Symmetry: C3
Subunit: 507 residues, 3 copies
């Protein structure tokens, strides 16, 4: 029983873009990309504040008595071992994203420096990438994850973001004016979310083909996408996602290990203890970077970096949020939070220490893989400066390929599950539908922009993300009232008032 009151209203906006953005006008879509600067200008501070708010909030609810509450029936045990549960979070913290921004990210920060420091600054440069990729985003993923994993397993509700707002909203048939709306926002956000990954993931393949066959064609993008958006429909008949799920991790294993030993090992090893310290050291300092610091200048830097990421992450929380939820059944609220923060974070700490960590060492010996200044080639260029690095580049391409599909599967499945009343049992057909409709806008962005295709990709996803921002914000409140009414916290507060009164009349 598909939810059409939610499916089509979403497809109305997904098409609006592909139609009005490539077919007709085209130059007009770049008008809404001025509504970008509109949103960062005045809704900008929100992302910054509630950003760091999401990181405290979650730690404190995990630190609280809530943490003990078992996600599922009372004293329910997890379904997999700690090791297997963690062995699944690793696959959650890897994909196109890190492929793209792995090397270029910390390099840019070394190259140009971060608003508030000089250029050529390892400590800062590094601790900024962390800022983006460790605690902060995963704090979000936890908010949405816990909210879903709680309402479904504990309270006993449908697997829908709206079913997490029940404590605040009607109710009496949750999905009146809101609900449908809240879900319609989830859907849209997830599309543009994955869109970026597919998007910047695509043209990182095209730029990568300039390692085998030789330059930056245009019909090539449509090729790389369509070639893989077909393989996605192909491998949309089994799951599937689990086969390649490791096929990805092994390739990602090669790339890393390889560059660990061939590259400046001891440097890369120095970056671990080093880029965990500057992270902590600078955390608050970068927590407060807005468009006032540094002397009303960092406004631009935020738009291109810190505020992009924040939007992106949010527009992905509906996807990642279900994943971690679905997996974590059984875990305690705390075990699930501390788990969700530190686990993926370790990998995002090593990964940037390896790839973009050599890019810094290189730029210190003159080597410089800057390659004309485009990140989309930065990666391969990095490898080409290492022995047998040309085969590695080939691997990387086939890797971003396997990523394109697996990343699209999980996305479409989630977007499917919530496009039809939270049915865990995903309809094989509606899944592929959300993939093509997604890959679609993942292409509609890449094409409409030209030389700065990357730009519009990040501006729209920021736009469609902003609405949800508020959703997730509110998902705190629904999550606190949901917890304060939970048996185990209610029953405990009854035991200390009793463990107080029992000694109030014996004296």
């Amino acid at each position: 029983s598909l939810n059409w009151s939610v499916i089509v209203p979403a497809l109305v906006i997904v098409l609006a873009t592909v139609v009005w953005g490539i077919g007709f006008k085209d130059s007009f879509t770049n008008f809404a990309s001025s509504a970008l600067s509109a949103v960062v200008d005045n809704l900008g501070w929100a992302f910054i504040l509630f950003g760091t708010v999401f990181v405290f909030f979650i730690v404190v609810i995990a630190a609280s008595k809530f943490g003990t509450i078992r996600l599922g029936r009372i004293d329910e045990a997890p379904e997999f071992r700690t090791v297997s549960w963690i062995s699944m979070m690793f696959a959650a913290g890897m994909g196109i994203d890190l492929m793209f921004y792995g090397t270029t990210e910390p390099l840019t920060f070394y190259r140009n420096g971060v608003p508030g420091h000089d250029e050529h600054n390892v400590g800062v440069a590094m601790s900024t990438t962390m800022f983006h990729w460790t605690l902060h985003p995963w704090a979000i993923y936890a908010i949405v994850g816990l909210a879903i994993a709680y309402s479904t397993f504990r309270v006993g509700r449908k697997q829908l973001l709206s079913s997490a707002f029940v404590p605040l909203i009607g109710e009496k048939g949750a999905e009146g004016w809101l609900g449908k709306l809240i879900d319609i926002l989830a859907i849209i956000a997830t599309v543009f979310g994955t869109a970026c990954s597919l998007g910047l993931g695509a043209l990182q393949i095209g730029a990568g083909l300039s390692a085998a066959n030789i330059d930056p064609s245009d019909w090539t993008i449509v090729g790389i996408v369509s070639v893989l958006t077909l393989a996605f429909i192909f491998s949309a008949i089994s799951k599937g996602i689990q086969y390649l799920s490791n096929a990805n991790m092994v390739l990602a294993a090669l790339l890393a290990i390889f560059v660990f030993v061939v590259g400046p090992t001891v440097s890369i090893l120095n970056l671990l203890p080093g880029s965990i310290g500057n992270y902590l050291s600078n955390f608050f300092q970068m927590a407060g970077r807005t468009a006032m610091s540094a002397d009303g200048t960092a406004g631009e830097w935020l738009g291109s970096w810190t505020i992009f990421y924040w939007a992106w992450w949010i527009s992905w929380s509906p996807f990642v949020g279900m994943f971690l939820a679905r997996i974590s059944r059984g875990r305690s609220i705390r075990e699930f939070i501390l788990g969700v923060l530190l686990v993926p974070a370790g990998v995002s700490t090593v990964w940037f220490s390896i790839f973009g960590g050599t890019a810094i060492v290189f730029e210190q010996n003159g080597e410089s893989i800057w390659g004309d200044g485009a990140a989309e080639e930065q990666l391969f260029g990095l490898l080409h400066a290492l022995p047998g690095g040309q085969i590695m580049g080939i691997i990387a391409m086939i890797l971003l390929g396997t990523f394109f599909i697996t990343s699209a599967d999980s996305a479409s499945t989630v977007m499917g599950t919530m496009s039809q009343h939270g049915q865990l049992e995903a309809n094989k057909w509606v899944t592929a539908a959300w993939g093509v409709a997604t890959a679609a806008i993942g292409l509609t962005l890449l094409l409409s922009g030209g030389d700065n295709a990357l730009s519009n990709l990040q501006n729209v996803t920021i736009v469609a993300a902003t609405p949800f921002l508020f959703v997730v914000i509110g998902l705190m409140f629904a999550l606190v009232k949901d917890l304060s009414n939970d048996v185990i916290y209610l029953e405990y507060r009854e035991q200390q008032r009793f463990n107080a009164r029992l000694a109030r009349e014996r004296r």
Copy 2:
């Protein structure tokens, strides 16, 4: 009822100082002002060390078991609602200058920069201000407000600073040396406290009239206002069925809210709005450095800046601890210390942060855009400069002027109320005569400090505020132990104490 064993030493010393500052004695009270440097130099270490400890202390106390413990007969019906604090918290604690400082400070620290940094640093300029007006000034209040409220609304003892030292001194044996000296210094500091509040309100008016009517305060101004506000306060204190403290404060929040909301919308809204995360994050970051900004840093330079700022800021604060602290109790009963510690922390922080961010932040926004409002550089002229720079300036200016008048009568009467309550053997309710009488006891000096001829006198008291409570610093430190080695003699700890151990 009127305790005349402490009224005397105070009424005489307070009269001794005013004389040694008037009648051609105006110069020898200035040389005595530079004797302040003595304390800032040798007790510098003292303030900047413990000022930060208190902040950790209440936290470490709210954190532990002592937190759950209400203050009273347990589950004792609270009383005053949420609006009780926010009002008096900023009505008695501050309000007067925190309108001049709401702009001149964040605007100064930007322009000239604080030690160990470079100028035009928005972050620092906000973190330093914030530092001077949050966790710190409210812990050296919480300590007091928590101690007293416990040694009365729990134990039952009488509301008087020495009574809270019972745990350290002895059962009633606090009558000797340590105990009488307390009440004197607590009265001196509260008499000067009001005196300084009356003085600031007067220097403000000068610039207020400059906004409305100017004219380089040609006499009449100090009297025709300080008296107007004294005679306006002496009326809102007499009428029993009036309670100006519970009203004017509420009105005060409404005026300040109005004013704030004005600039916040007409002015650089987003800037203010970007300054919220900007302020907090920065504050958290620059906390442990500016917490340890000793006069040894940097390279020995910050000596002056500290004394003129942070230090003076502390020595000044420590003074208003009796009054403000007592008030954090005279209007609270039944709500656990924990729901109180953060009550006077998380909450005052919020308002101050926001206030500065709005004003101070806007000032920086102006400073950057080239349309400054620093002009000539008088702290007392800047608030209005920023104001008149906005549509409906002169208008909002009038109410801004009124604001300085509001809370004033309260900050003075409520400052005198606590006096009347600490003068009559620590009685919650005090005679309507002793309270208002002390609220004007400073007026008798204010009119003599100007009869010297022309103008050049008040400057004394400004610096005398520091040393006016210099010793009262330690009165806090000990009060910190008298609150730890006292709660461990409470019901829950004494039962496990007198058990197997």
Copy 3:
């Protein structure tokens, strides 16, 4: 009994480096000094990363329920009690070091400036010195301290160090590949660690007596230093016997606390008392920015600084942790895990600071004027240089050397107590025989390190030490697990977690029923 299986492979290489340094290829030992530039740069990261983790590690253990477990057969009324602790913390652990680096480190930093900062930074000058002599170092101790203390006094087994590794290598069956090898690497690390401190006395005295007499070189003149101070040392020797030590604990106080309260009241009392919160503050504000200092920061240019300071320290501390944990363990019986961790960290770290605040402070304040104490760049000269600049500079200068004479025996005595204890199957009783034995451990290298044609047998001192116990790092690493995977099996904690379960499920039975009675009842209103 004696372990002629761990001590045999012991002195065989203890001297295979001693006679190797003084004899054989004299300048071949200067190839190992360029061989640490293989660990310091290749393991420097691993020395930092885990060094910091060490400070979080215990701190949580301290706050953990583990922090209630008492150390030894439940009750065990506190053995020594207090004071003797903080006195034997340093006397044993630090002691002499607090001087031959404690009044010059805040000074060298105020001068040259640490990497990532300009010179003349009172702040970093204080912050970077503490990073080395406070929270970080002691935390390496409290681990081995607990691991060892809990291993012996609680469980009730041997005082041999490798014992604490039975929860990981199996109990009673961890003697072979791993086990004896640990004890071997243990005794060595304690010999060198001690030999270094003993040789320092001669070096600091030879170049320290300059404030009195002996302007000659520094070779045969020192024969009356090493050979005499050790001669007067063993006494001791004639009698022990079982405990103190001690006669040095209250000594160090009266003595140090004297010269300290001396400079604190004579010198710039305020400039010191000011730098009091300034020390702590800046320390906290820079803690994470210091633990992030690597040979990749700043801009891959601080390696030769770190290698001279930070890593230098960390490496050494692990190579000195055996003794200082073996000794820290005693006098701690009947003291809880918590009060032990908050004992080794808070107070020792809380005094080192006020030490650098008085000595490092005035030493700095003297430079802010022009009366520099810097004596041609020599650690010994600076110490006396700043006290002879105060009324009675030769009256306290006396104690500057004569007191350091006590620290000589404090280390040796206490240290020997440990190395002796670990070669006797791990018993506690005072073994006079082995005590004085290892007491030698320097007569073949210490006094010979100088007879090498006059002097210059450096740095064959610091070189051999930090490389000796380079695997020790990975030992104090896996010591965290053997500490926690052991603490957790303790009856008191084993019972704490079981009770949780009970309450847990019982509380479910109470609930699952109501929702089945307020349900049948709810279906009764129909």
